[PDB]
Amino acid sequence: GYSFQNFDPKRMARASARDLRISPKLAVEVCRELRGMMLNDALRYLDDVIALKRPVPLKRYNDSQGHKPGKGFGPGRYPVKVAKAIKKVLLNVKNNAVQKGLDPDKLKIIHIAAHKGPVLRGWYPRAFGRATPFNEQTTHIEVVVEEIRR
Amino acid sequence: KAGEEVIFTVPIKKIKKIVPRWKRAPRAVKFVREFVARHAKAQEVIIDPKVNEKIWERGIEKPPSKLRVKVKVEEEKREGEETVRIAYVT
Amino acid sequence: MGKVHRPRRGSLGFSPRKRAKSIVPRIRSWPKETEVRMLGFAGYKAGMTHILMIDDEPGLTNGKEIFMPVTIIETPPLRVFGIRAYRMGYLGLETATEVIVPDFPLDNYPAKERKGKPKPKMTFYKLLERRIATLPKNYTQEMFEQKLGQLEDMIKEGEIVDVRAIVATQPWVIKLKKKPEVMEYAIGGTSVEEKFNYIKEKLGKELRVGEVLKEGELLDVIAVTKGKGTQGPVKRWGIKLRAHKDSKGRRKVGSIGPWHPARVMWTVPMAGQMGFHHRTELNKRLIAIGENGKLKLDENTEIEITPKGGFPHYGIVRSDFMMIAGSVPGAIKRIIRVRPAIRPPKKKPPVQRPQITYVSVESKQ
RNA sequence: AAAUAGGCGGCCGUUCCCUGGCGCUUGGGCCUGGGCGACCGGCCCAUUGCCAGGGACGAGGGCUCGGGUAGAAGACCCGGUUGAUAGGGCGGGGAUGUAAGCGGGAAGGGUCAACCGACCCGCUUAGUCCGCCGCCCCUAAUCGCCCGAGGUCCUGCCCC
């Protein structure tokens, strides 16, 4: 669904993604980082991540992963898959908003939040006659973008 | 510099001890690719099957110490680049 | 337990083994004052040679030929940027004030053909510009307000303690840096006013090996040693080998400790930084001072140095130099600073200008 | 990061306007009765200050690029055309030991002729090679991004 307030006629535009086959933890680091920016900066940010230029800092989940230089937190990594996938969500808010009579580029991103969805589960082998879960997480991520201009 | 052509010698020497020895030959090629791109100020480049053969000739293990290469600069259309370089052995 | 003792491996006296706080060496400990003369001087390690000398250097003969390995060091000339004043507090020595010299001569500098734009380098010390220490913003004004501040300090009179000098390099032939390394050297005499007079003359002056230091003395050397990176328990502390044939073990400490005590001591061998550590090594004999190198017109007190083909990993030596006995702590191309000895041997006398029979002329390669 | 939480030198930030409301709100000088004084009362000044509505400017530093005297990542150190950092070319210094070709010799065997020949010598201190140094800007050190403020909430020392 959607997990935040709306005033979609002239001050909000929304879109959501369901069952994206992506890491939920890597969705946590991008949503937080991206949050509070305008759409255009958010496109720019995603494009840099894919190039393998600006790192996404690891923060809340962070363990056993190498640091990355510069201002921003010690560890970080690049979630290419998620950046491509989220770019599509954002593109959908952008096409929609224009029909709705909002100008997308100026609208700031109030809210982006990730939801750990259903779990694709099975088995892959281990030793001693035993099989262990081998799972892919399927993730929903919502975006609600809001006008701000003078 | 714009329009043609540079003849350049690319030193392969990084290839030894930057990566190991069989798989010097895949590494040489990345060096040839970088050197040319760098010098060009360009994209990854296209390099002729003749450079490959040259690196490869002795085998995966023994690539040669230098390799002389001829590069050109050209444009394109549609939208995009400067940024395209055709290079072959000389 | 066999009831057999094992003497400790590694020291805790050059511990903790961890990276230097700066590329510049540091100093607290200053050697004996007895003369109104410059204390401490600097160079870059060029490489190494070996030398034949006539003993001199008192020991097991005092007349037969002796082999002594040598470190050839290119010293830059230095330029005293400022006078640092100290006042003595309650808790330790604190810097009262400083005079700097913003003021600009054009540097003995060269470089560069192409040619169309020589583009002038005429150096107000554009090397100060390349030094990331900042500068007023009215050169004349600043120097004078400080000079007046000095005059006060000299007047009061005994409020002021000793004088030390902020001194910086001049790269005017060295290609391994182009940014002044900035340091402190003390100016000793025996009483403040004599140090105050000397430091004031000194400031505008490009100075030598000759000014600071004399041949035939023993000297300390202060430096940050060459960085290995991280190295093993084997390397850092020393470890012995074990029993009949061990595949599994070999480079191993076994015990870190007992079960109670329920902690790890800091004296047990582990991996971590080795090198890039600060060391002062005592009593290295000053073989030689000269300037150039390559040719000198006189045939005694050198005939002039430099192997042909340079040295591996060092540029051309052409400027004032010093050749010091034995090992020098550091890597090739690193800044080393030289410290007079605090006291030298006394069972072995220093003897001035030691006799230099012959100098190497072969490359290190 | 010694909580007695240091010392110095330099560099920085160190703002406007209409309209309405307020000012011993803020700040100084003078007279006189009272006070040691601050203070009350009388006289004099403010391009000013304050609240509400809109509004400027941007020192440092990283990321970037060429390499390392540095290095598990990250960091460190140096250079970036105000330049010789890296590579080319050339030349200097080093490593190996005589290159390919050709010419002659060469145990012999053959119509002892055209020749078949391991090997030897000359050419040739050759040839091949360098993680080093110098000359030299030819080539590549471009292009471009950011984060980081806004003499400080309130108090007291000296003036305003």
Next chain:
RNA sequence: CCGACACAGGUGCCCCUGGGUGAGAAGCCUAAGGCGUGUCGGGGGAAACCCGGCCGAGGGAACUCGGCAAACUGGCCCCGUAACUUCGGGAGAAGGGGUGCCUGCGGGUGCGUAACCCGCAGGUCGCAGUGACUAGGGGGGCCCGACUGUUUAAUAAAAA
């Protein structure tokens, strides 16, 4: 196929005479034929540490329960060969020498100069001629059990 797994496992035959090699259904290389899905890539000249493996002066088991591990010998030809003895064996004892390429001959079998094989002399290069791969270290006393075989399918292969 079977082992839950597309498991380095392990289940029959046939091609066992491909070429070079060399005693060879050996190794290596290579042909017909097959593949690069023994299915995750890239980076750090890659530091410590760990597995496989290479090399170590001088010394030559000082290590350790113990020469364990590892090393050495090494193919082939020739010479020579002890104690002991069930006379069969020990024995490939031990130890010593040689071995390449070229040039020219001889012998054997044959038929007439084929196909191979075994010797001989001269010339000559290297540090090294089984130069690689293949490829026993040897010797002596003692205990036990005759031997070959079998054994705790899966911590004991032994003297049982």
Next chain:
RNA sequence: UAAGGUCCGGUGGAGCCGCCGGUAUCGCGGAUCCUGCCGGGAGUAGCAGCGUAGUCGGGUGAGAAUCCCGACCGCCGGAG
């Protein structure tokens, strides 16, 4: 006292209380409890060790280090 009762708001959209007398496969914190669902571990280990294999152009496609074509470089040789 309390075991537990009762009222309001949101949600939900058909059944439900009280009293009195009865009755029981009648109240749960543990049982290396049983079953079911879920997090940390981790974005770590594995995706290496055995004779260590790919690579450049080009084709196709929304997406190509591992699909195909050629060239080039290899392993295998009673066996891959």
Next chain:
RNA sequence: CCGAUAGCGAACUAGUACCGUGAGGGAAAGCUGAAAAGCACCCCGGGAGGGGGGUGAAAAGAGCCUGAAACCGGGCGGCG
């Protein structure tokens, strides 16, 4: 009497799937709505995926009545 972790092995695709050479062993798996109107038409999207509008009411939108806890994101308050 029980009421879907209960009661028959089994409210159903059960003596099924599956295990075991075999004898034998053996689960889980119920609920749309008044009507299927079971998603047309329109915008977007590589898109069989996904979002807005379209139902009395979609926390009635396809194992779809209700829709807890553990737990996971975001936000609010507070601490930091």
